[model samples]
Target: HHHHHHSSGLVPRGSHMVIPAEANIIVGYSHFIKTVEDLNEIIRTHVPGSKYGIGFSEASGDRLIRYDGNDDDLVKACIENIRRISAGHTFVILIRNAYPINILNAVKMCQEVGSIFAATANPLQIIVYKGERGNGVLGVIDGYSPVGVES
Candidate 1:
């Protein structure tokens, strides 16, 4: 009989709770750091007069939260949230005067992974767990629990 047990590191644990609500944001990811600038270009081109900030955490290389956007405040928000999540290949976007519907397709088209996590202005929770290396995102918890069935 052969058995294997490589138990050394402690099991992953997570901390996620309500995030105070304030702005409209979208969360998603892509492959490369270059997606930072590409996101900027797509948003700028697709939505006229739209102000936005995007923050992306690289899974490799420097693994820094890379950010870019037209609005300074939104940019700061993105940076803060991305830092809060501290997950790889993750991105947070705060937008003004624009809905996710406006630019979601554009972003998905441009993004290598081509899917968004969430997009809304409701209070949220960033589900995270401590991984072998560090932290990872389980994505944003959208709003409160459903109390009634949808018609």
Candidate 2:
């Protein structure tokens, strides 16, 4: 096996690459969802405003990246990320002029949401992998780890 090291003294392993995101972006990954409608309702019922975008990849059936949002730019941003990380049954959401706290709880409370990978306003980097089948998000570096406990 081989590992790549950076001048910063960090060794990055596995077949992966990093994608940087804007400071205002919020990305999430759901384990599985039955249908696009289920994913739609999770966001529709929770997000009050129309300034966000959501993209979901269906694992079965047609298995396409399903997306919808009131804001065109936000929708495009979400879809762009989804294409980069082509994981099955995973969803990506991007919101502008707001924070994830506004609807993160509701997103988590949704029965369909299995887990949330990240939610932040800091500079972000998504570590992704490209296998024989397709690409998927391995993990993310939302920001630096806590330097220390709360002051």
Candidate 3:
């Protein structure tokens, strides 16, 4: 299923590469494999030549911003698939990282789980990588620059 819509041009010019390129999988809000089995089931059936994978992540910052899809099998599949396919390469998983707790939890999770490299909090955006390589990913979806307010 494809919905053709106008491109608002809000996304940074070369940012798409950061997703399907660096990550090989792009997890967004809704319409994920987990949400509707059809999305995942159909993709696997019809799209044969495609080596990419897709999943979903909760982008809500209601309590504390964090990656809340660890319980989902699809999300785990995407992460593991990249780990297995991409050798010596970095794959970034970006999520809303807004609070200090999110930041601390992300760091601790990475340290303990030994999965991604870094995730930032305090203005909340999480970027998990495949290996402990470096300060791999960090940014605000709205261009990373802080929005200035006039007083």
Candidate 4:
């Protein structure tokens, strides 16, 4: 047999997106419905006028892309971004008028948050694997191409 496509065939694909300077992005894996609520709370309760958006992709059950945000544009962007990634059990966060450094840790501390894959404003490429009903993120190529070494 050349290859068994009928059994456990994992097709990998790399997705790319450039994060605009207007918003900082945070991507991570998490499971639970309350993540949206808690992320909203953490973001809202922080520095005043710190606009942000939260998007969580459900891995099972209803399998919905849940979202919450004070900024309309940011929330919409988050939704679109998550839809593009189309990976399971992933959360994409967009922060505007604030730095990830300001609230990154608190968001990490949230009970629903499992682990943060990346927190940056740089461009990104997500290495993803998909087959049948399975979807997974193999790794993240977060940032730009190599240029010069340290000065």
RMSD of each: 4.9, 6.4, 17.1, 3.9
TM-score of every candidate relative to the true structure = 0.74, 0.69, 0.24, 0.78
Question: In order, what lDDT does every prediction score?
Answer: 0.66, 0.62, 0.32, 0.69
Question: What would the per-residue lDDT of candidate 2 be over residues 1-151, giving only the tens digit for each residue?
Answer: 6544333222254222222344245455665565656666666756666367777777678878888877777777777777766777667776565555655654565434656666666656667665444556667877688878886
What tens digits encode model 4's per-residue C-alpha lDDT throughout 57-150?
8777777888988788878878876777777777788777875556665465543445676777777777767655656777788777789899
TM-score of predicted structure 1 = 0.74
Q: Candidate 1: which stretches are off by over 4 Å?
A: 1-22, 32-35, 99-112
After TM-score superposition, the amount by which residue 79's alpha carbon in candidate 2 deviates from its true location, in angstroms, is 0.5
| Model 1 lDDT, full chain set | 0.66
* TM-score, predicted candidate 3 vs. hidden true structure: 0.24
Best by lDDT: 4
Off by over 4 Å in 3: 1-85, 88-92, 120-151
Lowest lDDT 10-residue stretch of candidate 1: 11-20
User: Which portions of model 2 show Cα errors greater than 4 Å?
Assistant: 1-24, 99-101, 110-112, 145-151
lDDT of 3 by residue, 46-110 (tens): 33332333432222223111222322443455455333323222332333212434334433433
Clashes of each: 0, 0, 3, 0
Cα RMSD (Å) between model 1 and the true structure?
A: 4.9
